[PDB]
Design a protein around this ligand. Structure first.
Ligand code: SPH
Ligand code: MYR
Ligand code: MYR
Lengths: 116, 268, 5, 60, 283, 268, 82, 60, 132, 5
């Protein structure tokens, strides 16, 4: 959370494993894996997306057989600020792997080319 | 703790869900009793119980309401408030019998410049008074059971005069705790206060309480959650402040007996 | 060295 | 690292052996040993919950 | 400890019988097959049995390279209007029929795959010209890596994809690959879809092929002639042979009885009469 | 047994349900493997599973069909056939993943004067052939998944010629086991035969079978139950005999992972 | 002694929690990444983990020949001007 | 001078080994053993001067 | 600590200089390696080194810049940024060779009513792209 | 002779 010290808020961060309607309302997102983040001195909050898959490994491309589900964020209460305070701000998000995370089958990337 | 642990900063984790808070005022365990499954020595229905465990014992967030200078208070019943929540509600309507404890987490943040105080009360058998002076005990099932939207308290008793087609609903007067007893004493029930300068949440861990080991969840509510403004909402010099209140409740150690076809209740 | 089956 | 095993000799001209050394790190690179096991057909031929005694009535 | 090359059981000598033991009588409704041997219904002599089931072990039944595809490439004159043909093949055992029928005696399998490549070339025009010895590049492009759009574009760099540069007229190329499935076994049959159609979404959006799992299951092989264009055009074929080494199989199945029609279990009208005429009381 | 116990007389009890039979032909445990929960050594999704136990592992009776001289056969898929059965179906649509074994009990009685024989086959990954000769692998989800009504076999392949709006359904030819292989060999799959003079039921105990430890129940069926008349129905000298066939299936050792909001599939 | 082909850590079963320990709350300004595992924010089962990082070791990531150049040469007729 | 090591066997048909002999004097000529070690990510993931306890406030 | 010690309140002292802070977010030691002198086992030039110690290993404050709504970012290189700082810079220009570690302390205070976030990155061999 | 890893 990058708003001011005077800004408060509760947000809901969600992970819904695949197979149902992708959550568009807090009502749905609540029902899946989630964290309710209370903004304060510990500036950041972490949600762990646990390995939940039918296959033992997923593909590194879009694939419906090995789909992973839905990450989403909602307002739990609302951002509240006093007067003389910015009413808008930014949050920044980060991703990283847990210690149980692995990859295999080495391959060339599409993220670089050499036309001509 | 000299490693940083605080009374005010808590994390609760049930099922696939986590709640974090940085402005708590400890948490309450009603009557000092943590929730528990039904013991063989106290058992009554003889069939194998279903215990859905993490699929039902997880944090369900209800619809958020809004606290304003005119708010008189809000109420919900358990298990009624949760009847439509995932596999808990399903387990509830499929079985004759069920029992459950609950972690209740009420959420309300504001700013160091706002003020106000909510009394959050967990009441066993929270029987509320009706709107009529021609017929006692006549609040209909549908009106007694709002589901997750809950109900509200009123500062005034307006008796239902339509004798042809009575409203048949509650008329819960706030300084009377909606039941003919003074609100100032509701503190003898398990409670916490959300006083905006001190904390932004209330957390009540509730055991299954009843004169029986297990009962009809569809016919009877074990607990009532009542939230009233002990000191009114106020902010800066604004005349119409508003801050949201969110309820999140998790069933705990819940088990069900008497499986049959599903109950399909008349709710409207 | 050697395994013998 | 040499593996020495016996051949089952069909047409004849003691035990004759043959030698095998794996040249690669990946077990996938290896030849097939053909040192395989047989099993009883029971899971397909007798999948009944109560053990069948062939001299007895199959139905009793 | 009973092994595939062990001799089967000896026939034991058995004499006349008159009792309440009824081996011949049984009841197939139970789902079991009567475990009988000749000494149960006739008089037998003693035979010391030498025969073994060594060649019908799963490994032995499969221990053969089977052709699964024929890839075509060329290297034309630089003056041609048409592009230089490079080849792209989706890896599968279902483009041909024989190894397919053998694997489908079973529902699931695990194996290490041995691929062997036979390459042949020829002249196409009644020229009187030449080409020099060719080098082929067989590139594995796994699902997600960039597929070649041109015989000479950047993807043939292969910094991370595995490639074989095969020289014409040398011994046929060969590599091995471990069990690479994303499941605990390869599924020869998948009774399902890769998408659930949701009500709240359009039918088109929820649609997928019956019995198909991952659209690009195993990626592709891309083959090219590395030599530059030659005045005389040469055409080549790369025949791919598949052998399943170190194999395990599960859940037996009746073999394919009517002609294959696509990668699924579908059948074509007009092919559904495998059996021939034979009279009940005719030997 | 000299105390009376017979091969033919069985009682199976799962949850609040019991099946009795006095004309059984033993019972089958597919591949000799009894159903089991997923072991830690083979586990894959890391979240706490839900195991609903007696609320889902009980005998659900499907709709009864009728066997006549013209019947060519019937089929169902699992778990599809059970998708709407009590708390099992609910647990299925609420979770990304699920696995289950099953006791299948097929019921069909008649009289000592009737005759006929049903082959009852449990097939892993029972992929059935489509109705088209213009497009392979095109049976739509809705048609692949009849739910509890199941589908039927046909003695004739009639290809769908409406290319504008294709039927997009199966066309399972009976002597070809609906999948291009000869019916006479379906006995290599776990089976029993209901031959009216001998027995009046089939009982197959099925383990969870799959190339994975757990999978999408909504996307994939693990087993197919196929029932075909090996010898036709016949009675006295009546030309139109009919006897009913009833399916009762119980899920066993079933567990579910990946809880979220409920799946709401497009089934028609 | 932990090697590239060793299996990664087992998931340990973990139950419900209500305490002052706050794994989910953190502060990325410090420059550190929160070392969390699923049992920190959800209930887990016990899983015996078999997967390994063998193919993403530096050696394995690079263990491939990559084209770095294409050199052109010829041998012409002796009569050529070039 | 033969080096004998075990393979990690993936698909199966005891320990299977493989053999390696270096034919040249220069270590540069040798194949890659792929016998590599893993290490903790800490120098990149936790480079803070004061040890982080994940259950505790990162800031106190 | 129950005697008051905090993650947020630090004092660093090098040479004749001290930095105090009451709103720190711990501190970072790049790649977990504290700075060190060159070891004999890794040495290369054979001449006696000069180690100026406190005369060069002390806090030099650079020119202050200003962060506004239009700021896109700033960069410096080391040792370049310090080339003109006291006896460090002198030691640098007098010798063919030199090596050094660094404590970098970036300072920026505001109020409980302001907001914004600076990413402060230490990059080894920070080669930047040209204008052409 | 032999080293065994
Ligand atoms: C340089 C050449 C490298 C070639 C590498 C090819 C690796 C591709 C693995 C293919 C495995 C094919 C297995 C057969 C099919 C599957 O059994 C079934 N359709 C179900 O999963
Ligand atoms: C075990 O193998 C010890 C005995 C070694 C005998 C000589 C090995 C023959 C050449 C092997 C080459 C190794 C393959 C990479
Ligand atoms: C150690 O290597 C002693 C065992 C030797 C076994 C035979 C070696 C095989 C041929 C090696 C040729 C040497 C390469 C220059």
């Amino acid at each position: 959370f990058c708003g001011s010290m005077m800004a408060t808020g509760k947000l809901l961060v969600s992970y819904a494993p695949p197979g149902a309607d992708p959550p568009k309302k807090r009502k749905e997102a609540m029902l899946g894996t989630h964290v309710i983040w209370d903004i304060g001195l510990q500036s950041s909050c972490t949600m762990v997306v646990p390995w939940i898959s039918n296959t033992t490994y997923r593909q590194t491309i879009d694939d419906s057989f090995t789909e992973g589900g839905y990450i989403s964020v909602f307002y739990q209460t609302r951002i509240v600020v006093p007067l003389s305070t910015p009413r808008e701000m930014d949050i920044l998000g980060f991703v990283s792997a847990c210690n149980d995370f692995s990859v295999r089958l080495l391959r060339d990337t599409t993220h670089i080319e050499q036309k001509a | 703790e000299a490693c940083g642990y605080s009374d005010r900063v808590l994390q609760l984790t049930l099922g696939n869900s986590t709640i974090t808070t940085q402005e708590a005022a400890n948490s309450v365990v009603a009557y000092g009793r943590w929730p528990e499954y039904l013991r063989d020595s106290e058992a009554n229905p003889v069939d194998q119980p279903t215990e859905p465990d993490v699929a039902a014992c997880r944090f369900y967030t209800l619809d958020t309401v809004s606290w304003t200078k005119e708010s008189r208070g809000w109420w919900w019943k358990l298990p009624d408030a949760l009847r439509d929540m995932g596999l808990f509600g399903q387990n509830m309507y499929y079985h004759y019998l069920g029992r459950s404890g609950y972690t209740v987490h009420v959420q309300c943040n504001a700013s160091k410049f706002h003020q106000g105080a909510l009394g959050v009360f967990a009441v066993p058998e929270m029987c509320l008074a009706g709107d009529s002076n021609t017929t006692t005990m006549h609040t209909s099932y549908q009106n007694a059971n709002p589901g997750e939207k809950g109900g509200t308290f009123t500062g005034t008793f307006t008796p239902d005069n339509n004798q042809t087609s009575p409203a048949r609903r509650f008329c819960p007067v706030d300084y009377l705790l909606g039941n003919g007893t003074l609100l100032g004493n509701a503190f003898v029930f398990p409670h916490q206060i959300i006083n905006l300068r001190t904390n932004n949440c209330a957390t009540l861990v509730l055991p299954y309480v009843n004169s029986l080991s297990i009962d009809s969840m569809v016919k009877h509510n074990n607990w009532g959650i009542a939230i009233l403004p002990l000191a009114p909402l106020n902010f800066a010099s604004e005349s119409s402040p508003e801050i949201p209140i969110t309820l999140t409740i998790a069933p705990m150690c819940c088990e069900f007996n008497g499986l049959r076809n599903i109950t399909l209740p008349r709710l409207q | 060295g050697s395994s013998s089956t | 690292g040499a593996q020495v095993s016996s051949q089952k000799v069909g047409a004849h001209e003691s035990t004759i052996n043959y030698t095998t050394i794996n040249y690669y790190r990946d077990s996938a690179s290896n030849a097939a040993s053909k040192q395989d096991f047989s099993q009883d057909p029971s899971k397909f031929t007798e999948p009944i919950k109560d053990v069948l005694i062939k001299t007895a009535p199959m139905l009793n | 400890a009973a092994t595939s090359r062990d001799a089967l059981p000896n026939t034991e000598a058995s004499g006349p019988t008159h009792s309440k033991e009824i081996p011949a009588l049984t009841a197939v409704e139970t789902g079991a097959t009567n475990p009988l041997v000749p000494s149960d219904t006739v008089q037998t002599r003693h035979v010391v049995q030498h025969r073994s089931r060594s060649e019908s072990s799963i490994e032995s039944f499969f221990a053969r390279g089977a052709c699964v595809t024929i890839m075509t490439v060329d290297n034309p004159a630089s003056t041609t209007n048409k592009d230089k043909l490079f080849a792209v093949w989706k890896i599968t055992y279902k483009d041909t029929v024989q190894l397919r029928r053998k694997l489908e005696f079973f529902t699931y399998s695990r194996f290490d795959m041995e691929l062997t490549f036979v390459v042949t070339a020829n002249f196409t025009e009644t020229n009187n010209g030449h080409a020099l010895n060719q080098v082929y590049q067989i590139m594995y492009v796994p699902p997600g890596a960039p597929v070649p759009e041109k015989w000479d574009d950047y993807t043939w760099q292969t910094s991370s994809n595995p490639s074989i540069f095969y020289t014409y007229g040398t011994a046929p190329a060969r590599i091995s690959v471990p069990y690479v499935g994303i499941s605990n076994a390869y599924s020869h049959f998948y009774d399902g879809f890769s998408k659930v159609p949701l009500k709240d979404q359009s039918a088109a959006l929820g649609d997928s092929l019956y019995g198909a799992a991952s659209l690009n299951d195993f990626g592709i092989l891309a083959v090219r002639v590395v030599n530059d264009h030659n005045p005389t055009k040469v055409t080549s074929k790369i025949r791919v042979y598949l052998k399943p080494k170190h194999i395990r199989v599960w859940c037996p199945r009746p073999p394919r009885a009517v002609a294959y029609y696509g990668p699924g279990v579908d059948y074509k009208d007009g092919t559904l009469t495998p059996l021939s005429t034979k009279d009940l009381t005719t030997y």
